[PDB]
């Protein structure tokens, strides 16, 4: 599912135009996926905090 997630770029048998296109396409792919990565990291910090929250209130409810 990751080899699917990555895009198999046409790399070898193209001209300058479509090869630069492949390059910039997958580059902007990496770009927006770093955006989603950092969003997920922020969510992940929030959820870890709320997890410590949950254990705290458990002790408060335990």
């Amino acid at each position: 599912i990751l080899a699917e997630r990555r895009k198999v770029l046409a790399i070898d048998h193209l001209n300058e135009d479509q090869l630069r296109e492949k390059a910039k396409e997958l580059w902007q792919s990496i770009y927006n996926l770093e955006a989603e990565k950092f969003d997920l990291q922020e969510k992940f910090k929030q959820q870890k905090y709320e997890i410590n929250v949950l254990r705290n209130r458990i002790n408060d409810n335990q």
Partner: protein, 160 residues
């Protein structure tokens, strides 16, 4: 006290529309503010709640803090919310939890007197010892000196 205009904020407007629609009826003929407190029972029976003469007489005493038998729309909306917490929606518990992580800048899972203090300073509102402890105990239900997260919810649910 300030919970009057608080409720005026806290209350939603589709409420106050029918609030005034039903408020239109109290006038027993040629009245301009001469509302009585014996009718407090009946008027609490009108607006859609199911009250009992005990709480009717209490609010006869618990309300009319002005003693004139009168109640402002501010007092109206508060004694709505001070019993029926028709407050400012208590935006969530989980939006609240994301707020609570910012309360516990120290990633505590609990708003302590320190986090209470620093966060109210982030408001700009100064720290009187009552302030934080008024907020602490009103939130620190466990009275651990600090407001844990669900302590914060029951604390700041029904709160903007």
């Amino acid at each position: 006290d300030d919970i009057y205009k608080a409720a005026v904020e806290q209350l939603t407007e589709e409420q106050k529309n029918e609030f005034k629609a039903a408020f239109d009826i109290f006038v027993l003929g040629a009245e301009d503010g001469c509302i009585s407190t014996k009718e407090l029972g009946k008027v609490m029976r009108m607006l859609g709640q199911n009250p009992t003469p005990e709480e009717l007489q209490e609010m006869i005493d618990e309300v009319d803090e002005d003693g004139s038998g009168t109640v402002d729309f501010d007092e109206f909306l508060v004694m709505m919310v001070r019993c029926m917490k028709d407050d400012s929606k208590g935006k969530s518990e989980e939006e609240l939890s994301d707020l609570f992580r910012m309360f516990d800048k120290n990633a505590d899972g609990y708003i302590d007197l320190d986090e209470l203090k620093i966060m109210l300073q982030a408001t700009g509102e100064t720290i009187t010892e009552d302030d934080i402890e008024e907020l602490m105990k009103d939130g620190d239900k466990n009275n651990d000196g600090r407001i844990d997260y669900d302590e914060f919810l029951e604390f700041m649910k029904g709160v903007e």
